[PDB]
Amino acid sequence: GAQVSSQKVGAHENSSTINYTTINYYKDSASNAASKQDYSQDPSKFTEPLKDVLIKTAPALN
């Protein structure tokens, strides 16, 4: 049940893709560490909540 993923390598040694291994030891998902691989989303629901969303090169009020 080993889980393998790629690290995002910041500073590189003078030595490519590097990995790390994760194994969950507990039955309750609460006990698990954080994956930290998280998906991002559109600001739109906050920055543009308009019924008729308009395009930036056009007049906001028409």
């Binding site: 049940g1 080993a2 889980q3 393998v4 993923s5």
Partner: peptide, 4 residues
């Protein structure tokens, strides 16, 4: 294993 599950290599992602």
């Amino acid at each position: 294993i599950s290599e992602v």
